[PDB]
Curated annotation (Swiss-Prot), chain B:
Maturing lymphoid cells and central nervous system. Changing residue 66 to A: Loss of DNA-binding. Changing residue 227 to A: Deficient in both nicking and hairpin formation. The gene is Rag1. Homodimer. Component of the RAG complex composed of core components RAG1 and RAG2, and associated component HMGB1 or HMGB2. Interacts with DCAF1, leading to recruitment of the CUL4A-RBX1-DDB1-DCAF1/VPRBP complex to ubiquitinate proteins and limit error-prone repair during V(D)J recombination. Disruption phenotype: Mice display a severe combined immunodeficiency phenotype. The have a small lymphoid organs that do not contain mature B and T-lymphocytes. The arrest of B- and T-cell differentiation occurs at an early stage and correlates with the inability to perform V(D)J recombination. The frequency of homologous immunoglobulin pairing is much lower. No obvious neuroanatomical or behavioral abnormalities have been observed. This is V(D)J recombination-activating protein 1. Changing residue 120 to N: Loss of cleavage (both nicking and hairpin formation). The chain holds residues 481 to 800 of 1040 of the full protein.
Curated annotation (Swiss-Prot), chain C:
This is V(D)J recombination-activating protein 2. The chain holds residues 1 to 351 of 527 of the full protein. It comes from the Eukaryota. It comes from Mus musculus (Mouse). Signal peptide: none annotated. Keywords: Chromatin regulator, DNA recombination, Metal-binding, Nucleus, Zinc, Zinc-finger.
Length: 80, 320, 343, 80
DNA sequence: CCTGGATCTGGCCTG
């Protein structure tokens, strides 16, 4: 269920226009973020109790705000 | 190409390909420094010469024996000249885009471009033999793309051109190539500050460009999204990668982000980092160093590139 | 003229060209590190300690009411005398110049602890332009003190500067500035004996007279063998500045000053040309109203100094300088450092 | 070419008069030779010897640049 | 006979 949550959350920050490619996964990103957070806190207490990597914080915390602000994240990536 | 052209002309008798002096003469139409363009108002600290191409990215940095030893090679385009060239070769795309949206072709409305900027250094580019300075074996490239072009028709905003495959290698247009190290701060700031000066000037003016028989009017919006986390922390003036303050968009700390984990808001900016570095170096409250850093939230250096609060997605994938 | 190689620990990547050593009470302190100050030392100033030809850079905290100054890369230092230290001008890490004056003094000293205090002095009047490569000194005339500031190097002014020549520098105006530190006042003085700009010169202070010499003039690209003397008396009215050109000067630029004995100075380092290095040492024996610049014996340089093209250093204070050589291709540690005793 | 490179690095230290030497003295002889070869013969230094380095090294110009760093002259005529 | 700091010191985050 950890990997299921992460694959529910990946096409929101990877899609080049996520409001017109996956709105169903976008509209409930907050619930999947909180579910991922409590599954890190409870079932994986031995690693993420008192420390968490930066990209996990960026992924769980901010990206509904960024996708409201700009519109996409994978369009504004750096792979080019 | 010379081999292919020479033996095709030798076999068929005809001249199917052009000789490469004709390629060279037809090449200069698209290189920077060809077209007329007028800024309105004129740009501060920018000459109005319209024939400036590949220039030394040192911008006349003093290489004498008496002062700071520079050891980098750089070549760059002037920023406005490159934006004119990149707007002029995709003229046909802009015309077809406004044609497909039921607009005219003689329209000269104020276009709002949005230009996505990106910089990343590289490693293990080998230094050559021969004469020149003691160049490090790293390169740094600064480049931009043109994401969208939006013209205002009627009351609302319509878009004309959209980059269809935005992460291509066909649309990351190069702007400056230097043989520096992005770990080094002095040579990086020295090479890179002319482009930031040009960009800061161009943020507040208009460009007039003759596009298919009609003079039209452009204005730009620059977004620096294409930097990784290390370069954002090293340029925007925050602490390094292993600090107790983690997010480059908010003021949270590592333990209190391990506790809450969801509920934040984007807080950092560029002007806020300017006010914070002035708070750090002015020290208005006579506080000691630890409570100073706690007041200023880890800002302890002068930022020198405005980078927007966003997330690189490629390194986000690799980190997860 | 003993010349020794000096090793150094895990902070050799912190010493750049243009550093500055301040000597507080026989204790040497480093200032002007490379890059913005790390979290290992948030102030930027360090404890320059050598024994057994080994060097260690410990941090040094500030006072509570002090100001955290950027690492200036080519400032103008000065030794006031409640003993303090004057720095003004120079490059920040982001290659802009600073027009501030910072005053360095010890706030408290414990059992091998030091906490500096750094405050910022505001200049009104004829504010000099932000520059580097210049020099400042203080003089004592009629029981008063005044900071004399000669010109250096700076960028083009803010209307003549274009981005295609953005880092192009030009020599400053040859005026002389009188800075009153206890009031924050500066008055320019134009003198007909000084016609060219000058940078990276050495300047020797006295009661009321400063002897600037050497120095590379950018605009005509020469290192002229001159020697000026500026006599400043402090009456009730305006202070009368008088430069007289003297003969007997030498032709160097960015050489290093040191004070071995009282009324005794040694000139070591610097350049004669681009492709030439000042390999001799100039003994400057002062007087009350005389300057006798003579050549001493030369220190036996080693082959890794005689074939370098660059070097740089500063004055540790106790008759000993500290100069550094560019090692080789960075690829190991990029710098070889030396020390040099002077009687 | 690598054997002659070691001979050059061993002649600027006068090992025929200093038959014992530390590690760091040999390292400094190598760094001095590298800097002078870059200054004179425009050669960047490499750890794996190539063929173009071998052709550019086995000249008389390189033995002049190396003889600039020997104190003696019997070693000059021997290397010549 | 602590003991209160100086001082390492290995782990963690990003490339
Ligand atoms: Ca890279
Ligand atoms: Zn955050």
């Amino acid at each position: 269920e950890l990997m299921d949550l992460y694959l529910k959350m990946k096409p929101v920050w990877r899609s080049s226009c996520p409001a017109k490619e996956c709105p169903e996964s976008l509209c409930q990103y907050s619930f999947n973020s909180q579910r991922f957070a409590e599954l890190l806190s409870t079932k994986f207490k031995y690693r993420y109790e008192g420390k968490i990597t930066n990209y996990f914080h960026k992924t769980l915390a901010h990206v509904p705000e960024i996708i409201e602000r700009d519109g996409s994240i994978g369009a504004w990536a750096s792979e080019g | 190409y010379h081999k292919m052209y020479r033996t095709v002309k030798a076999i068929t008798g005809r001249q199917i390909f052009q000789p490469l002096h004709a390629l060279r003469n037809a090449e200069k139409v698209l290189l920077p420094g060809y077209h007329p363009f007028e800024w309105q108002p004129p740009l501060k600290n920018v000459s109005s010469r319209t024939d400036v191409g590949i220039i030394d990215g040192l911008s006349g940095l003093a290489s004498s024996v008496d002062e700071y030893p520079v050891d980098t090679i750089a070549k760059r385009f002037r920023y406005d000249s490159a934006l004119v060239s990149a707007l002029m070769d995709m003229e046909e795309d802009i015309l077809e885009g406004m044609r497909s949206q039921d607009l005219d072709d003689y329209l000269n409305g104020p276009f709002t471009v949005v230009v996505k900027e990106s910089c990343d250094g590289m490693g293990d580019v080998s230094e050559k033999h021969g004469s020149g300075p003691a160049v490090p074996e790293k390169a740094v490239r600064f480049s931009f793309t043109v994401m969208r072009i939006t013209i205002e028709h009627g009351s609302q905003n319509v878009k004309v051109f959209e980059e269809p495959k935005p992460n291509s290698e066909l649309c990351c247009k190069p702007l400056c190539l230097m043989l520096a190290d992005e770990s080094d701060h002095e040579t990086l700031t020295a090479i890179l500050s002319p482009l930031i000066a040009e960009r800061e000037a161009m943020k507040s003016s208009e460009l007039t460009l003759e596009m298919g028989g009609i003079p039209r009017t452009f204005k730009f919006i620059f977004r620096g999204t294409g930097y990784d986390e290390k370069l954002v922390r090293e340029v925007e003036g925050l602490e390094a990668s292993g600090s107790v303050y983690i997010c480059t968009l908010c003021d949270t700390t590592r333990l209190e982000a391990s506790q809450n984990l969801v509920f934040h808001s984007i807080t950092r900016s560029h002007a806020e980092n300017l006010q914070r570095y002035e708070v750090w170096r002015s020290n208005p409250y006579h506080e000691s160093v630890e409570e100073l850093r706690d007041r200023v939230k880890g800002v302890s250096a002068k930022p020198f590139i405005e980078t927007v609060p966003s997330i690189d997605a490629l390194h986000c994938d690799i980190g997860n | 003229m003993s010349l020794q190689m000096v090793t150094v620990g895990h902070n050799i990547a912190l010493i750049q060209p243009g550093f500055s050593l301040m000597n507080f009470d026989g204790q040497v302190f480093f200032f002007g590190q490379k890059g913005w100050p790390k979290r290992s030392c948030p102030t930027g100033v360090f404890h320059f300690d050598i024994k057994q030809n080994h060097l260690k850079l410990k941090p040094a905290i500030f006072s509570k009411d002090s100001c955290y100054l950027p690492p200036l890369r080519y400032p103008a230092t000065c030794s006031y005398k409640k003993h303090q230290y004057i720095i003004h001008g120079g490059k920040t890490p982001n290659n802009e110049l600073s027009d501030k004056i910072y005053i360095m003094s010890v706030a408290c000293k414990n059992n091998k602890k030091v906490t500096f205090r750094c405050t910022e002095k505001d200049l009104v009047g004829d504010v000099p332009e932000p520059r580097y490569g210049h020099s400042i000194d203080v003089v004592y005339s009629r029981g008063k003190s005044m900071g004399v500031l000669f010109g250096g190097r700076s960028y083009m002014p803010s209307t003549q500067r274009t981005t295609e020549k953005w880092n192009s520098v030009a020599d400053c105006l040859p005026h002389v500035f009188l800075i009153d530190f206890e009031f924050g006042c500066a008055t320019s003085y134009i003198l007909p004996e000084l016609q060219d700009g000058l940078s990276f010169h050495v300047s020797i202070a006295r009661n009321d007279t400063v002897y600037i010499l050497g120095g590379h003039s950018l605009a005509s690209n020469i290192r002229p063998a001159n020697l000026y003397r500026i006599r400043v008396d402090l009456p009730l009215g305006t202070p009368a500045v008088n430069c007289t050109v003297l003969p007997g000067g030498i032709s160097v630029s960015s050489a290093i000053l040191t004070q071995t004995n009282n009324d005794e100075f040694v000139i070591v380092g610097g350049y004669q040309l681009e492709n030439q290095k000042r390999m001799v040492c100039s003994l400057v024996s002062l007087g009350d109203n005389t300057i006798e610049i003579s050549e001493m014996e030369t220190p036996d340089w080693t082959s890794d100094i005689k074939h370098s093209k660059i070097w740089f250093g500063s004055n540790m204070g106790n008759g000993t300088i500290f100069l550094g050589i560019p090692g080789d291709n960075k690829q190991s540690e990029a710098f070889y450092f030396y020390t040099l005793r002077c009687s | 070419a690598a054997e002659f490179y070691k001979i050059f690095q061993l002649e600027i230290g006068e090992v025929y008069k200093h038959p014992n030497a530390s590690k760091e003295e040999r390292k400094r002889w190598q760094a001095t030779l590298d800097k002078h070869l870059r200054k004179r013969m425009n050669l960047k230094p490499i750890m794996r010897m190539n063929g173009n380095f071998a052709r550019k090294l086995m000249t008389q110009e390189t033995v002049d640049a190396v003889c600039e760093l020997i104190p003696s002259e019997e070693r000059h005529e021997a290397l010549r």
